[PDB]
Amino acid sequence: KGEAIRIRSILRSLIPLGDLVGVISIAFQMPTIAKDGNVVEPDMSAGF
């Protein structure tokens, strides 16, 4: 369907593959247990 191929082409033009790959490759921040080992969970309302 020419409309479907057009939509896919538009989305591919909008979003490069490398950008998605890099964002997926972006690292997280895991909680740490230090200073007697109490869990230090990073706040998620500010995190990735």
Added chain:
Amino acid sequence: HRTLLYGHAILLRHSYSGMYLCCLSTSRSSTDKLAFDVGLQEDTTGEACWWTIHPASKQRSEGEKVRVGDDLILVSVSSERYLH
């Protein structure tokens, strides 16, 4: 000698070169991403060489015949963009 009606798919042929106005798939546009380049193509087959006329303002109506001196909006069939 059919008459141009707004919304029809028109074919524009370059008088000198003999090719037809088309929307090239190449993207030379300066950081426009979704925009293409307008050029000339030999083969008529394909929706790229076909353009649709749309009224510039409210004086004209969809399906009405086009008149001399009117302003136009040309929409490519393949890309669904405008001659900008």
